[PDB]
Design an enzyme around this catalytic site. Sequence first.
Site, mmCIF file in Angstrom:
data_model
loop_
_atom_site.group_PDB
_atom_site.id
_atom_site.type_symbol
_atom_site.label_atom_id
_atom_site.label_comp_id
_atom_site.label_asym_id
_atom_site.label_seq_id
_atom_site.Cartn_x
_atom_site.Cartn_y
_atom_site.Cartn_z
ATOM 1 N N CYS A 161 2.789 -84.713 -4.801
ATOM 2 C CA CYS A 161 3.313 -85.320 -3.587
ATOM 3 C C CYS A 161 2.597 -84.789 -2.363
ATOM 4 O O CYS A 161 2.312 -83.597 -2.279
ATOM 5 C CB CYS A 161 4.807 -85.101 -3.477
ATOM 6 S SG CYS A 161 5.683 -85.995 -4.787
ATOM 7 N N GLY A 209 3.978 -82.176 -8.446
ATOM 8 C CA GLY A 209 3.241 -81.323 -7.517
ATOM 9 C C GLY A 209 2.230 -82.092 -6.664
ATOM 10 O O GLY A 209 1.629 -81.512 -5.754
ATOM 11 N N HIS A 235 10.759 -85.408 1.733
ATOM 12 C CA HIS A 235 11.543 -84.929 0.606
ATOM 13 C C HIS A 235 11.277 -83.479 0.226
ATOM 14 O O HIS A 235 11.959 -82.953 -0.642
ATOM 15 C CB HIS A 235 11.567 -85.885 -0.594
ATOM 16 C CG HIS A 235 10.303 -85.999 -1.384
ATOM 17 N ND1 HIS A 235 9.762 -84.952 -2.087
ATOM 18 C CD2 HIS A 235 9.535 -87.064 -1.651
ATOM 19 C CE1 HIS A 235 8.663 -85.379 -2.716
ATOM 20 N NE2 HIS A 235 8.477 -86.649 -2.422
HETATM 21 O O1 LIG Z 1 8.590 -88.886 -8.388
HETATM 22 C C1 LIG Z 1 8.727 -87.777 -7.923
HETATM 23 C C2 LIG Z 1 7.515 -86.842 -7.870
HETATM 24 C C3 LIG Z 1 6.268 -87.285 -8.672
HETATM 25 C C4 LIG Z 1 6.134 -86.952 -10.018
HETATM 26 C C5 LIG Z 1 4.979 -87.363 -10.696
HETATM 27 C C6 LIG Z 1 4.009 -88.044 -9.986
HETATM 28 N N1 LIG Z 1 4.163 -88.415 -8.742
HETATM 29 C C7 LIG Z 1 5.252 -88.001 -8.060
HETATM 30 N N2 LIG Z 1 10.043 -87.288 -7.434
HETATM 31 C C8 LIG Z 1 11.187 -88.196 -7.521
HETATM 32 C C9 LIG Z 1 11.363 -88.951 -6.199
HETATM 33 C C10 LIG Z 1 10.680 -88.787 -4.995
HETATM 34 C C11 LIG Z 1 11.047 -89.623 -3.946
HETATM 35 C C12 LIG Z 1 12.084 -90.494 -4.231
HETATM 36 S S1 LIG Z 1 12.521 -90.187 -5.874
HETATM 37 C C13 LIG Z 1 10.225 -85.926 -6.891
HETATM 38 C C14 LIG Z 1 10.923 -85.001 -7.897
HETATM 39 C C15 LIG Z 1 11.422 -83.825 -6.981
HETATM 40 C C16 LIG Z 1 11.713 -82.458 -7.262
HETATM 41 C C17 LIG Z 1 12.143 -81.606 -6.232
HETATM 42 C C18 LIG Z 1 12.278 -82.107 -4.915
HETATM 43 C C19 LIG Z 1 11.988 -83.454 -4.629
HETATM 44 C C20 LIG Z 1 11.554 -84.315 -5.665
HETATM 45 C C21 LIG Z 1 11.156 -85.806 -5.678
#
Ligand SMILES: O=C(Cc1cccnc1)N(Cc1cccs1)C1Cc2ccccc2C1
Lengths: 301, 304
Positions: free
Chosen positions: A145, A143, A41
Amino acid sequence: SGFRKMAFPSGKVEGCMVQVTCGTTTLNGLWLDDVVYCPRHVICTSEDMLNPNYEDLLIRKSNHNFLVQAGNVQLRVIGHSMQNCVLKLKVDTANPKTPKYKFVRIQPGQTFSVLACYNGSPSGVYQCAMRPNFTIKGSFLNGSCGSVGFNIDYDCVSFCYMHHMELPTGVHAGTDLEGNFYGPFVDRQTAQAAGTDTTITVNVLAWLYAAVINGDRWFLNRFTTTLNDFNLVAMKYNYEPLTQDHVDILGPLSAQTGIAVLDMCASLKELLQNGMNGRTILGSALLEDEFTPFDVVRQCS
Amino acid sequence: SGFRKMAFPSGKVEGCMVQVTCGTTTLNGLWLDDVVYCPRHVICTSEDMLNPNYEDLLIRKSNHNFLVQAGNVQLRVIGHSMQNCVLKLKVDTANPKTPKYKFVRIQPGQTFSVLACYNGSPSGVYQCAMRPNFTIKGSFLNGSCGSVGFNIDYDCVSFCYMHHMELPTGVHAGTDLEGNFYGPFVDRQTAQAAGTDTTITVNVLAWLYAAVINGDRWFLNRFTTTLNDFNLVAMKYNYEPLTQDHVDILGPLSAQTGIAVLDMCASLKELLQNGMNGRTILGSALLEDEFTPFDVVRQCSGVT
Ligand SMILES: O=C(Cc1cccnc1)N(Cc1cccs1)C1Cc2ccccc2C1
Ligand SMILES: O=C(Cc1cccnc1)N(Cc1cccs1)C1Cc2ccccc2C1
């Protein structure tokens, strides 16, 4: 003595964490030998997130669209491929700090350490379990991820988790290092929800054995149970079924303490019925389910 | 989202851990620049440990009586001396993996990460607080002596703890890296005990703020209190007094969540008086006191 939620020492993984940027999106990657692994992603924009076609997004990228930064050094990307929900970026330098490692896919109930990272730099380390509903109860901000989960039994790092997303209940979903999600989750922003979570019975039993090893017996009783009657009661408290495999796995702890597995099952039944009546077990007022039998044997003695 | 007991990444300290052997005793040492630090009790046998004269035990040892192993490499000890309850072994090679570091002495209530080690090999990392009674609730087996505690404040490792002993209640005692004990303990096998402990009030309040940030709000109420009235309640429940300094330190969290410190104190008052009535906070049925205000801000902001 003492009993703590203990993580593996994180140094072997710290030396593999890098920052991966594509366009405006930055996240973490794992650099092993000459490959950087990260969530696919990273190639998604704002409008992409509901129904991304990753094959179509990726064919439009060249190697030099991916910026990979390892500490202060830029790495050169010389190849890319997608495997399931991970991107593999081939780079022109093998990581000199690559540990002995393997990729393992874990089952619900298994524990691991998470090295939480932001901008390719480690923030903290903590212990997690793969819940029965294939989520983890982590601590992750925007951040994070591409942060990874691991075990180090011996000198070999077993990578088992890569972080991809946060679900609406505030729990976390991700993949193995071959890019297959745990559970029914997908890397799209469509409505998806964790199933009801349950308690990891075998781990609670392990932790009760830990309490006995550390000198606590108050919760034992004179009764035993059949496996089937145990399961009938435990399901009423949203406890996972205990299987014969699980009973087998608890054999060593049983032999150490002199308490038969089904005798410990009888103790657990009574604890569910009674609560703790103002007492604690290993410093907790709730039954703990994020220590495995293997974890207990490792930490106790 | 989420809130977890989180240790600092341990890599910078892992590269400093060595094995120290003197006679039949093996334990851990900390190798920084050209010195290895370890508990002075490494020079004792069992009967020595009954009533040791450390000065006298040490003069009988030569450099070559101390075997120091860094991974698979032997280091050469070229000098030895004592500072308080730590032994300093001068070696012939500076540790090339020495991080930027300082030795600091921490105050009760402050938290740190422990790298638990055996035979010079790191085994696990966890977070601890220095209890008001100057013990830590660690997890340590035989062989763990010389394991260290630390914080990382930037790229600089602040070492604050070296492990020396287990008390009869199964809690742990040790020194700073200048070899001064935390607490009224001595490095000898005589009867010693942890004093009655208290709860670290300012940390419980910090953790209540963490709970609110993570969406757990059931315990909030319309009431406020004063410092003096609150302190009357804390004393009754074996909570440390809350000071104005503590209130000042929680100021950020107060402003962010819209809950004044004394408003949160009124929440805590009620919890102490009434309990939790079947509910949990951040998945706990007990009030947690091993997160500092700094810990909460750091984890609910994302510092690296
Ligand atoms: O949940 C998250 C990230 C997150 C936040 C807090 C803690 N852990 C993880 N996202 C949504 C999804 C990710 C995969 C399926 S839905 C991110 C947000 C985003 C912004 C810019 C490009 C890509 C993305 C994906
Ligand atoms: O408490 C410990 C060690 C320990 C054990 C478990 C967990 N943490 C630490 N010792 C006793 C004391 C240490 C300082 C004052 S008393 C050991 C036992 C021993 C036997 C022979 C020579 C030296 C020693 C030191």
